Amino acid sequence: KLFRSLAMTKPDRQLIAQVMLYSQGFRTAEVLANKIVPFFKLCDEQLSSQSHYDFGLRALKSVLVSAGNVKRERIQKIKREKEERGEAVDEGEIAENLPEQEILIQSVCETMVPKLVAEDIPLLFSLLSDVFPGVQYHRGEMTALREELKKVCQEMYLTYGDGEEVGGMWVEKVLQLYQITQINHGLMMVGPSGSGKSMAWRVLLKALERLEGVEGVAHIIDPKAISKDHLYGTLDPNTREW
Amino acid sequence: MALEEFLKQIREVWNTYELDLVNYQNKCRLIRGWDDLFNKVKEHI
Amino acid sequence: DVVVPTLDTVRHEALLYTWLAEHKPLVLCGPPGSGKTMTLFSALRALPD
Amino acid sequence: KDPLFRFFEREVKMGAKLLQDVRQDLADVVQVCEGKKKQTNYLRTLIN
Amino acid sequence: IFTGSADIKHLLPVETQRFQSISTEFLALMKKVSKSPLVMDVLNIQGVQ
Amino acid sequence: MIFNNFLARLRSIPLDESPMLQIQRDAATIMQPYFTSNGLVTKALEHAFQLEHIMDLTRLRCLGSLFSMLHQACRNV
Amino acid sequence: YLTMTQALEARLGGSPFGPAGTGKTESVKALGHQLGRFVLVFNCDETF
Ligand SMILES: Nc1ncnc2c1ncn2[C@@H]1O[C@H](COP(=O)(O)OP(=O)(O)OP(=O)(O)O)[C@@H](O)[C@H]1O
Ligand SMILES: Nc1ncnc2c1ncn2[C@@H]1O[C@H](COP(=O)(O)OP(=O)(O)O)[C@@H](O)[C@H]1O
Ligand SMILES: Nc1ncnc2c1ncn2[C@@H]1O[C@H](COP(=O)(O)OP(=O)(O)O)[C@@H](O)[C@H]1O
Ligand SMILES: [Mg+2]
Ligand SMILES: [Mg+2]
Numbered sequence: 001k002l003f004r005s006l007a008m009t010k011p012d013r014q015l016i017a018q019v020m021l022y023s024q025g026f027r028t029a030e031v032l033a034n035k036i037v038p039f040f041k042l043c044d045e046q047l048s049s050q051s052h053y054d055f056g057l058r059a060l061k062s063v064l065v066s067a068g069n070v071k072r073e074r075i076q077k078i079k080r081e082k083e084e085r086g087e088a089v090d091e092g093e094i095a096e097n098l099p100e101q102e103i104l105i106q107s108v109c110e111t112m113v114p115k116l117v118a119e120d121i122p123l124l125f126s127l128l129s130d131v132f133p134g135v136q137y138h139r140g141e142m143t144a145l146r147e148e149l150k151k152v153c154q155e156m157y158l159t160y161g162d163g164e165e166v167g168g169m170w171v172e173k174v175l176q177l178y179q180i181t182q183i184n185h186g187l188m189m190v191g192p193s194g195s196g197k198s199m200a201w202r203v204l205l206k207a208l209e210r211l212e213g214v215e216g217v218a219h220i221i222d223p224k225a226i227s228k229d230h231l232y233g234t235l236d237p238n239t240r241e242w
Numbered sequence: 243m244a245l246e247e248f249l250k251q252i253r254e255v256w257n258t259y260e261l262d263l264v265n266y267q268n269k270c271r272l273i274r275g276w277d278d279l280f281n282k283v284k285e286h287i
Numbered sequence: 288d289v290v291v292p293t294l295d296t297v298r299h300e301a302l303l304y305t306w307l308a309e310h311k312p313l314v315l316c317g318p319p320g321s322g323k324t325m326t327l328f329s330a331l332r333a334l335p336d
Numbered sequence: 337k338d339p340l341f342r343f344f345e346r347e348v349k350m351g352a353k354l355l356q357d358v359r360q361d362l363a364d365v366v367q368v369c370e371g372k373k374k375q376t377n378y379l380r381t382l383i384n
Numbered sequence: 385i386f387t388g389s390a391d392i393k394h395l396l397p398v399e400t401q402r403f404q405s406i407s408t409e410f411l412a413l414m415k416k417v418s419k420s421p422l423v424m425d426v427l428n429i430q431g432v433q
Numbered sequence: 434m435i436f437n438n439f440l441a442r443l444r445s446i447p448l449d450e451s452p453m454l455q456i457q458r459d460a461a462t463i464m465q466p467y468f469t470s471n472g473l474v475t476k477a478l479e480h481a482f483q484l485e486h487i488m489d490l491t492r493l494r495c496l497g498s499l500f501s502m503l504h505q506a507c508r509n510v
Numbered sequence: 511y512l513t514m515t516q517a518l519e520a521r522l523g524g525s526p527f528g529p530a531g532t533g534k535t536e537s538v539k540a541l542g543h544q545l546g547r548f549v550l551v552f553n554c555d556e557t558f
Contacts, residue, residue, distance in 0.1 A: 003525035004517035008532045046342050048349075056531040126337055157441040159434045166434060194493040196434075235557065260421040270411055271418040279423075305505040306498070309448075316487045335401050336408070 011057050013037050017064060024068040028100050036063070036104060039131045043112070046127060047120050052190045059111065066183055067107035074103060101135050109137045111183060114176035115190075142175065148207040149174060156206075158199060174200045178208075252286055290329045296322070303330035435493075436468040439500050448504055456510050464503070474499070511541055 014037045021029035037060070044055040075094065082089050105128060116124055128135070146162070149171060153160035161167015177200060181187060189197040205216040223231055235242055259282070262275035290296065303326060306313045315323035361382060367373045368383070375383065386392060386403050393400050417426050426432065443461045447454045467473045482490060514524040526534040535551065542549035552558075 003523040004513055004520075005525040005527055006513040008526045008528040008534050008537070011532050042339075046339060046346075048346060054531075057533060058531050123342065126342075130337065130339075157438055157445060159437045166437075170434070193491060229557075232557075256424060257422075259423045261417065261423055261426065263418055263421055270414045272414070273417075305502045308505055308508065309501050311497070311501045335404055 013040070013057060013060060016057070017060060020061075020064050021067075024064075024071065025095070026071070026100050027095070032100065032104055035131055036060070036108075039108075039127065042127050042131065043124065047123055048117060050117060052115060052188070062183065063104075063107050063111050066111055067104050070106055070110075071098070071100070071103045074098065099135075101132055105132055105135045105137050109139070110179050114173070114180055142178075144211060145175070145178070145207060146171070148211045149203060151210065152203050152206045156203070158203060170196050170200060174204050177201060178204055255282070255286070290325060296326065296329075299326045300330050300333075303327060304333060307331075307334065435496055436474070439496075440465065440468060443504075443507075448507060453507075457507055460503070460507050460510070511537075511544075514538070514541055 014033055017033035017037050018029055021032050026032055040055045040060055047053065075098070078094050078098075079089060082094075108128070112124065113121065125137075128137070150160045152158070153167075159167045159170075161169070161171050173196070177187070177189065181204075189201065191197055202218070205218055208214075209216045221231070233242060259279075261273050261279075263271045263273055266272045303313075307330065315327060317323055364373070364379055365382065368375050368379055386400060386407075413432075416429060420426065440461050443457050444454075447457070469475070478492065478495060481495065484490075514526075517524045524538065526537065528534060539549045539551065
């Protein structure tokens, strides 16, 4: 009785997407939102049910923020490429001649693909083709990261791979984990026992160590091997000391 | 000039000295020549 | 202490030795009284260290 | 590319998995009932 | 006195086991000395004294 | 992948801490044709999943046991 | 905003509820920042 309760059950995802795409500078914000919100609904109601799937408002917010960020990066790459190739840089045509739909699809594939099961990837790409016709996703090939992964795997007796070779899938998973670490500060590697998760993140950490020159320190904590009081802390009932 | 030559002779004796090991019933490789090693240590000290 | 040698006994002795020699953890599974701890201790008498 | 086939494929997957699970559980139940097999913890809970 | 006499195993099993452990340690030390017969190499063995 | 990792570790890391590593390389060379896709070990492991076991069967449990006792075979040699 | 302002005027608290991900904490923080207030977020558990 001391609080006034309000039921906040269905956020207006379409208006949120439209306004947040309009603010970031997307000229086609209306159609992009009307194509991306039903896309998330289609993913929710068409992909296989898994305990690690979320297609809610947080996922949509992450997709929109990442789409904006990669749009700024694409503007910057167009700037430098035009500068090194000639002198014709102007904001008008570059903003006009910008694949915004490709940017949105790139953000979606960077955020949603790594969490899908093997069988749902064709499902997601079919949904992308249905809702976003003609737009294709061509993931970047981080070269120096790949040779650094090669060196790290060779040093620690691990089997590197590429494409369809033995080791290609695990390297692809490492690259997706790297992308998600760049995008998100909260990571979960979900998969059956002994699927290569530990080696994947160790190899990624050592590759980033040897590439960027900053040293990576990993703290491995078993949250259930100790009580929650030992995991987070105790407040003394007597002395009120932490 | 004399003192350093004492140092170099001790250096070469102790970097070329080897323990005298021989076989013992095909079970191990035991050491003999305790007296010579001990006398060398006393004289060097 | 005494253990009567048997086919299963010697086979499990060999397996336990070839598993504990390299300090690999293991679990003996079976009904109570089957001889799991007897088999383990009889494999430990061959490893005095 | 057909969404209807996608939904139907999910439905048949879930139905087949549940049907196999239920039939296997019932077979274990009837085998326990004739004394052919011993009753396990999961079987104990299912019978209870 | 331990290996040559086989009756001491019956009378002193734990003594024989302890001496066997000491004998393995001493034989490891002997092998380490034999592979490097130099006096200083023996002296620089970690925790030799 | 796991077979390649085990073979590389056998050919690289000595078990004592060299004759031992030479024995390791020879044993790995002898075991190479069996540690392949659709090899004896792969087919046996596939068939092992069809049997009933006292506990749930995990591929890495059997693989680790096999690798451990292969190391012990190297120690025996 | 309407419900929380009505609660505040009556000197009552605000208790937005619903499934996770609907923007309840964010809405509370946005309302507090709209009035220029210092909004503190506490993750409550059994130790509080
Ligand atoms: N890319 C790889 N190539 C070869 N061997 C690998 C590779 N990745 C992992 N392994 C090996 O296979 C096993 C997998 O262990 P790993 O720690 O990677 O699994 P995991 O999925 O993190 O395990 P869990 O979740 O059960 O702790 C280990 O023995 C590891 O050395
Ligand atoms: N091969 C055997 N030789 C002698 N005794 C045996 C043999 N196999 C089983 N036993 C007897 O069976 C018993 C096994 O019990 P125990 O090993 O304590 O069970 P658990 O391993 O489940 O604790 C021992 O008391 C032992 O005397
Ligand atoms: N009206 C809105 N406009 C833009 N983003 C929103 C809106 N409502 C919620 N969000 C986004 O949803 C995400 C999760 O909301 P949050 O308040 O954490 O949900 P919960 O009520 O479960 O805590 C936030 O990151 C926020 O940015
Ligand atoms: Mg792991
Ligand atoms: Mg919240």
